[PDB]
Amino acid sequence: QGFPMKQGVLLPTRIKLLLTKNVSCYRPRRDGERKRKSVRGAIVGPDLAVLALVIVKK
RNA sequence: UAAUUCUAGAGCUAAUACAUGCUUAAAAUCUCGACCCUUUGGAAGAGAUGUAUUUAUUAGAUAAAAAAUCAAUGUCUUCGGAC
């Protein structure tokens, strides 16, 4: 669908959260505002469409 | 990702952003008290004191005169201690 992954939620799905200032996946327009957005969980599965890979040793 | 002032991973470098942290007069006054050897003693040395926070306890005088008194003392000693 488009949604990104967030480390800390122990589900293989997506859910609605109330994001805050210094946390990733959100960027506030005014000061002191918080929005409810929807983010995808931290467990991989057949639904994904990309994946991040860092070569820690070749 | 069909999509909205949606955003993920990897790589750089700044501040009146964020996090730390030194400098300086002399004086006085307190407490502790090495010693001292003595009467009625005096003393080295030590530490404490900005402002702000919280609690407790004191100063923050005043309507009109003079003695007797208990001692202590500033002082001329008048070694009385009156002042």
UniProtKB/Swiss-Prot annotation:
<protein>
    <recommendedName>
        <fullName>Small ribosomal subunit protein eS6A</fullName>
    </recommendedName>
</protein>
<comment type="subunit">
    <text>Component of the small ribosomal subunit (SSU). Mature yeast ribosomes consist of a small (40S) and a large (60S) subunit. The 40S small subunit contains 1 molecule of ribosomal RNA (18S rRNA) and 33 different proteins (encoded by 57 genes). The large 60S subunit contains 3 rRNA molecules (25S, 5.8S and 5S rRNA) and 46 different proteins (encoded by 81 genes). Interacts with snoRNA U3. uS11 interacts with MPP10. Component of the ribosomal small subunit (SSU) processome composed of at least 40 protein subunits and snoRNA U3.</text>
</comment>
<comment type="function">
    <text>Component of the ribosome, a large ribonucleoprotein complex responsible for the synthesis of proteins in the cell. The small ribosomal subunit (SSU) binds messenger RNAs (mRNAs) and translates the encoded message by selecting cognate aminoacyl-transfer RNA (tRNA) molecules. The large subunit (LSU) contains the ribosomal catalytic site termed the peptidyl transferase center (PTC), which catalyzes the formation of peptide bonds, thereby polymerizing the amino acids delivered by tRNAs into a polypeptide chain.</text>
</comment>
<feature type="cross-link" description="Glycyl lysine isopeptide (Lys-Gly) (interchain with G-Cter in ubiquitin)">
    <location>
        <position position="58"/>
    </location>
</feature>
<comment type="similarity">
    <text>Belongs to the eukaryotic ribosomal protein eS6 family.</text>
</comment>
